[PDB]
Amino acid sequence: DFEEKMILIRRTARMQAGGRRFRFGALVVVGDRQGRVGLGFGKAPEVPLAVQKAGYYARRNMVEVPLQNGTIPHEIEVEFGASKIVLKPAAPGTGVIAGAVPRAILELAGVTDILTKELGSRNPINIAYATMEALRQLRTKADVERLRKGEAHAQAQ
RNA sequence: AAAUUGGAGAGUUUGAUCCUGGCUCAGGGUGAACGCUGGCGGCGUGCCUAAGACAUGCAAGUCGUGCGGGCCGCGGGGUUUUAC
Ligand SMILES: [Mg+2]
Ligand SMILES: [Mg+2]
Ligand SMILES: [Mg+2]
Ligand SMILES: [Mg+2]
Ligand SMILES: [Mg+2]
Ligand SMILES: [Mg+2]
Ligand SMILES: [Mg+2]
Ligand SMILES: [Mg+2]
Ligand SMILES: [Mg+2]
Ligand SMILES: [Mg+2]
Ligand SMILES: [Mg+2]
Ligand SMILES: [Mg+2]
Ligand SMILES: [Mg+2]
C-alpha cells in the first residue's frame, strides 16, 4: 500500500521472418513517503500488464532510506555502469532539486530537500539504478559509530 | 567573500539495445535593433558604425583696491584775443 510512479515506458522489437515483434518495458517506483522505496523494471507484451509486473517487482526490491529531517544524512556519489549520480543533502525549503528520474525515487522515499546532478550517461534505467544504489548506501553518525567503535561498543555508550 | 543556504535536464545514429560522440533546445543577461501592439508615472539610460567631414550659436575667463590712456559724454573750477 504505497504510491507508485512511472519512471518511463518503452517499446522494443524482436524479429521474426515477416515482421518486427514488440514488447513493452516499464520502470516503476514505489514509496511510502517515509523512508521506504523500491524500484521495479518489468517487461510484458502489453503496456499495462508490464506496469503491473513492474509494480510487483518494485515491492520486492525495497530500500530503507534513513531520512534525517526531510533530507539525507551525508552527501554521496555513486556510479552504475556509464551513469553516475550525486546526492548532496540540503537544508529545509530547498526542494528536491533533481532531475526527472531521481526526483521520483527521492520523492517517494520521503525526501523533500536534496541536491543532485546526473553525470555520465543519462540513461533513465541506469540512472534509476544508480540512485537506488546510492540510497542503498547512506549511513548515520549512529550507523557509522556502531561500525567503528563496534569491537568494544557499549563501553563508551 | 559569516545559518555547509547550494548543483533538475530533453531530443537525435538502431528493427530494437548499451556505450562513445557531435548537433540542438529549455535558463539568465543587453548602451540593443527589427515585427505586431502601445494608456500614465518615477528613476536610470540612449552613435556599439566613419578617431569620417563639419554651416551656425554658445563652451574660460577675471581684477579699476596693481597702471596709464583712446572714444562719447556729464558736472565743477582758474584763466593772455575766449581759445586754452
Ligand atoms: Mg540503513
Ligand atoms: Mg566509468
Ligand atoms: Mg544539514
Ligand atoms: Mg555523454
Ligand atoms: Mg543526450
Ligand atoms: Mg551506425
Ligand atoms: Mg529509426
Ligand atoms: Mg531573452
Ligand atoms: Mg508604431
Ligand atoms: Mg558621427
Ligand atoms: Mg565613438
Ligand atoms: Mg565654427
Ligand atoms: Mg588687489
Side-chain angles (χ1 to χ4, degrees):
Chain A
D1 192 30
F2 306 72
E3 318 172 359
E4 303 184 55
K5 289 231 72 292
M6 185 77 44
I7 279 320
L8 89 134
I9 288 171
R10 79 183 182 193
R11 187 182 69 169
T12 45
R14 263 161 56 245
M15 221 67 173
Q16 199 38 64
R20 327 234 180 287
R21 291 211 251 220
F22 309 97
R23 163 165 213 89
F24 294 96
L27 194 38
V28 163
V29 212
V30 154
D32 77 351
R33 311 223 192 217
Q34 44 196 47
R36 327 184 46 228
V37 61
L39 173 57
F41 187 84
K43 315 167 271 305
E46 217 200 328
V47 203
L49 213 70
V51 191
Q52 179 168 355
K53 235 173 152 175
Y56 178 15
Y57 284 159
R59 310 172 141 88
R60 298 197 325 188
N61 183 13
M62 284 292 307
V63 162
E64 318 254 326
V65 186
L67 298 165
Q68 265 198 24
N69 200 20
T71 197
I72 42 141
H74 50 65
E75 63 273 336
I76 193 216
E77 175 186 312
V78 157
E79 308 190 33
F80 178 100
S83 323
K84 159 190 194 141
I85 195 172
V86 55
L87 309 173
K88 199 179 191 277
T94 296
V96 170
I97 305 207
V101 162
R103 159 182 303 312
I105 301 190
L106 299 178
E107 265 161 14
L108 293 186
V111 192
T112 81
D113 302 314
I114 196 166
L115 293 173
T116 278
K117 186 96 187 73
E118 300 170 44
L119 262 154
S121 206
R122 290 310 171 51
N123 192 296
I125 320 196
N126 300 301
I127 294 294
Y129 284 154
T131 315
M132 275 290 279
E133 235 295 335
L135 292 165
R136 204 178 257 113
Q137 204 162 299
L138 301 132
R139 310 275 180 286
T140 329
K141 196 64 175 207
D143 242 342
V144 150
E145 271 189 28
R146 272 180 343 239
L147 218 59
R148 303 192 185 162
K149 298 198 160 180
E151 238 200 333
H153 192 205
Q155 169 110 3
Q157 290 153 348

